[PDB]
């Protein structure tokens, strides 16, 4: 008659054994079974690699003439409730959930005998909803926050403001043009401070919404420099609180991992996916890849189109370092001539800037891109590709640029000829000065030519690398180079803006049928043909860009984010939902 | 005997030895001083009364801790003789070992 | 020996490759029920007084 407790740790002697995290025995007992499956779905099984570097042809050909579109297995498993799941009229889905950690799937029957492949479930949140519904993980995130004593800087008003921006559809496409041309350099940002100052002032005074919340780079730069007299303050408090919360999430995540370390490295790498270095943010403007190759012990194979990448030594032969604009004072003409004399299709070389160690381990970029954005916006965003030469031609070939007569400081709209920039400025309801367009056309010298897409392949941790087949030891991820994410567009906007931009399906949080059908005519046709596609999970992206199995964030993370509530409780939920389900993560969960 | 503020109330609710570890030496094999010492004075292994924990107040349980300093017999050897000590019967090594 | 403190700090943090973590900064990390556990005996060994 002693009251004995039995917590997680006391049983840990059986949970951290590698017998638990191995799919070899599951795969044996499965493969040997008769009656293979008779439904070996093939969609999104593995990535397909292109020869042509252009993504516009990829998206066009993939959505050009489309028909009945398949939906993946996990997107179906995460749709049923628990009680409807366990009912034995949905059996083929139960039949493929033998093991909690390994998500298993069957290949195409033709070509070889029946075989099944298991891919590891990287994080807690990829556990399907009928086995861990949304409310469970909401409460678990609340519990985590109470454990680490994290104090929310962000107030709900700033989140409601972010969301009211996310559902604007009256968003100025010109603020988007500027945000696209800057592409994350300090010097060009300091070149154009009065431009964005006027922009933020007008967008915060005409309506109660704040612009430029899209790219993490503009947020960092505004908090870093324009904290001064930038705008009418009231708006600066928003950016203050945003960056403060971005740092407080890392305060908590560091407090989760112990002070104790494995060897030279700490243990914080293995417990949360955000803290791990091998994860890459979707929008990249600096040289992150080669730095990753320098830091990654596990073979971090990069794929640029058809061309592989595995060595720091080939750094010149595949990556063109974009010089600092001043150092390039002499090399402008050769760069410009390369556009007319160089075939950008299948270039297989990347134009990137020199890397800057922020001094944070890039945790902030991952936290803003993976937790804050999909929660505060219900994940309604896409990637965007741009043709920068059209942007230059719209900006520089304008009337006020050439005429030596026109003064430096005037309302361009009075002297503006009929051209697409007129319509853009009018729909963006902002009247800019001549100096600002001069500075924008000046920023052309550095800017890249087109936007590019890259694949990363990182081996898992040594704690979960136990697997039968080497292909499963890899984990795949997509990275955007020289591009930006976008909110929903308008229809009247997509008359002068289609002249410059195009839509991209992306990471689950940044893949959305609403936005992509808004931008593309063809994706709109596709969604109208098949309305069930409205959901973020059932959307079909080109395998050349997206593979639903072999990713960090599976479908259920996106499904939860679709119904995510804008409170900070759900922010805690999305934060804690990034734990890796590795034994050394179970130990840290036991400690707290 | 001083005691951490995080001692569980349930531990004092049930009859137990005030050391914070089980001190039932009859259980071990007879005449094994090493085994008896490993039962009484060790913290490499949890006490026999509660496996999940090792000791409720380590300030009295381990060798040379505060309670051991106060109420061990012949360790003082200079206290006044003639005054009974209720805690002496619990913390004395020779008496614990004679059972 | 030298009283110039800027050299002191820069000499400490210049090429530091191993960071030692003190003892008591380990105890304040663990909570109570995890502190008493017999999986952690190095730290508890020195909690006598």
């Amino acid at each position: 008659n002693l009251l004995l407790a039995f917590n997680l740790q006391n049983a840990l002697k059986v949970l951290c054994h590698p017998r638990l995290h191995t799919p070899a025995h599951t795969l044996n007992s499965l493969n040997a079974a008769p009656a293979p499956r008779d439904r070996r779905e093939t969609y999104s099984l593995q990535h397909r690699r292109p020869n042509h570097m252009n993504v516009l042809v990829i998206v066009d050909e993939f959505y050009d003439n489309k028909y009945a579109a398949p939906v993946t297995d996990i997107a179906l498993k995460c749709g049923l409730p628990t009680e409807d799941f366990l009912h034995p009229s949905n059996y083929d889905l139960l039949r493929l959930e033998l093991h909690p950690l390994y998500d298993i799937y069957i290949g195409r029957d033709a070509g070889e005998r029946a075989r099944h492949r298991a891919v590891h479930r990287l994080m807690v949140g990829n556990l399907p909803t009928p086995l861990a519904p949304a409310a469970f993980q909401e409460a678990r995130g609340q519990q985590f926050e109470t454990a680490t004593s994290l104090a929310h800087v962000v107030d709900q008003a700033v989140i409601e403001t972010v969301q009211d921006t996310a559902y604007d559809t009256a968003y100025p496409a010109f603020f988007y043009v500027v945000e696209a041309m800057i592409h994350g350099f300090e010097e060009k940002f300091v070149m154009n401070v009065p431009l964005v100052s006027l922009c933020i002032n007008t967008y915060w005074e005409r309506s109660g919404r704040l612009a430029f919340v899209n790219s993490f780079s503009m947020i960092k730069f505004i908090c870093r420099h324009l904290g001064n007299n930038a705008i009418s303050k009231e708006a600066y408090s928003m950016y203050r609180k945003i960056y403060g919360e971005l740092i407080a999430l890392e305060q908590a995540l560091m407090r989760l991992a112990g002070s104790d370390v494995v060897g030279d490295e700490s243990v914080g790498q293995y417990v949360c996916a955000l803290l791990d270095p091998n994860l890459l943010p979707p929008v990249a403007y600096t040289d992150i890849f080669t730095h990753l190759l320098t830091v990654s012990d596990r073979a971090p194979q990069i794929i640029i189109g058809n061309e592989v990448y595995a060595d720091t030594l080939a750094a010149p032969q595949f990556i063109e370092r974009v010089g600092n604009m001043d150092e390039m004072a002499a090399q402008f003409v050769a760069l410009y001539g390369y556009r007319v004399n160089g075939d950008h299709d299948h270039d297989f070389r990347l134009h990137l800037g020199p890397y800057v160690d922020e001094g944070h381990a890039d945790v902030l970029e991952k936290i803003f891109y993976y937790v804050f954005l999909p929660t505060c916006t219900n994940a309604h965003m896409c990637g965007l590709g741009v043709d920068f030469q059209h942007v230059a031609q719209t900006l520089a070939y304008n009337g006020p640029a050439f005429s030596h007569h026109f003064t430096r400081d005037e309302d361009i709209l009075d002297n503006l000829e009929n051209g697409t920039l007129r319509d853009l400025l009018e729909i963006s309801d902002l009247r800019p000065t001549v100096g600002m367009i001069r500075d924008l056309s000046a920023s052309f010298m550095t800017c890249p030519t087109f936007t590019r897409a890259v694949r990363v392949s990182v081996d898992n941790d040594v704690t979960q690398q136990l697997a039968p087949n080497p292909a499963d030891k890899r984990t795949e991820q997509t990275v955007l180079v020289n591009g930006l994410v976008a909110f929903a567009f308008s229809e009247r906007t997509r008359a002068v803006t289609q002249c410059l931009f195009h839509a991209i399906p992306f990471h689950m949080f940044y893949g959305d049928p609403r936005v992509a059908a808004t931008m593309h005519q063809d994706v709109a046709t596709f969604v109208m043909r098949n309305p069930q596609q409205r959901a973020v999970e059932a959307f079909n992206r080109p395998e050349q860009l997206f593979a639903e199995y072999r990713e960090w964030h599976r479908s259920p993370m996106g499904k939860y984010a679709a119904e995510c509530l804008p409170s900070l409780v759900s922010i805690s939920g999305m934060t804690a939902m990034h734990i890796k389900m590795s034994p050394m993560a179970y130990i840290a969960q036991a400690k707290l | 005997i001083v005691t951490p503020v995080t001692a569980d109330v349930a531990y004092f609710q049930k009859s137990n030895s005030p050391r914070g570890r089980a001190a039932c030496v009859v259980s071990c094999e007879n005449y094994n001083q090493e085994v008896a010492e490993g039962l009484i004075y060790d913290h490499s292994r949890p006490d026999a009364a509660y496996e999940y924990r090792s000791t409720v107040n380590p300030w009295a349980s381990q060798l040379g801790s505060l309670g051991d300093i106060m109420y061990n017999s012949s360790y003082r050897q200079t206290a006044v003789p003639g005054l009974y000590s209720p805690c002496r019967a619990f913390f004395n090594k020779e008496e614990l070992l004679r059972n | 020996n030298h009283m110039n403190v800027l050299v002191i700090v820069d000499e400490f943090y210049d090429n530091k490759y191993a960071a030692p973590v003190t003892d008591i900064a380990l105890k304040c990390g663990l909570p109570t029920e995890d502190f008493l556990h017999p999986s952690n005996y190095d730290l508890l060994r020195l909690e006598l007084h």
């Binding site: 002697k13 130990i587 | - | 017999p38």
Partner: peptide, 30 residues
Amino acid sequence: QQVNDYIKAKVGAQNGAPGLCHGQQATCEI
């Protein structure tokens, strides 16, 4: 190898028990 050894250290993996207050211990499975 060191990851395995650290997991072994934290988990409590490995005798006899000196004194048994209740009786024959009964194993538990999860």
